[PDB]
Swiss-Prot record:
Protein name: Phenylalanine--tRNA ligase alpha subunit
Domain of life: Bacteria
Subcellular location(s) of the protein: Cytoplasm
Subunit note: Tetramer of two alpha and two beta subunits.
Gene: pheS
Lineage start: Bacteria, Bacillati, Actinomycetota, Actinomycetes, Mycobacteriales
Family designation: Belongs to the class-II aminoacyl-tRNA synthetase family. Phe-tRNA synthetase alpha subunit type 1 subfamily.
Length: 49
RNA sequence: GGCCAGGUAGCUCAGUCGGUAGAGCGUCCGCCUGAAAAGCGGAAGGUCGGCGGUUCGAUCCCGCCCCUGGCCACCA
């Protein structure tokens, strides 16, 4: 429900994009991908819900 | 070229007919050891063979194609 509002999605997209722009090496980016796009990220749980 | 069964993690396989997909071993970390392994605890890792389509969304539905194993067939 609340996890599916455009406010809570944009909240997750904004946090995802923030970590992505801040990652400055390939190895930090991989951990960013895991946390903001992997099976347990906010955006992944919203597709599971 | 024919028939059957398949292609899912680094290896060996289970599984799923629309929104989470997994095990054994392999990898990494913490405690531990002088350093290890085991044990205990915790992670990473898959374009589910490919390209189109359908769909708000496809490992899963439709189309085309590719490869693997077995049994045939052919032959210097
Ligand atoms: Mg394999």
């Amino acid at each position: 429900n609340a996890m599916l509002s455009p406010e809570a999605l944009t909240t997750a997209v904004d946090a995802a994009q923030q970590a992505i722009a801040l990652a400055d090496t390939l190895d930090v980016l991989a951990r960013v991908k895991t946390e903001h796009l992997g099976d347990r990220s906010p955006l992944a749980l919203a597709r599971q819900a």
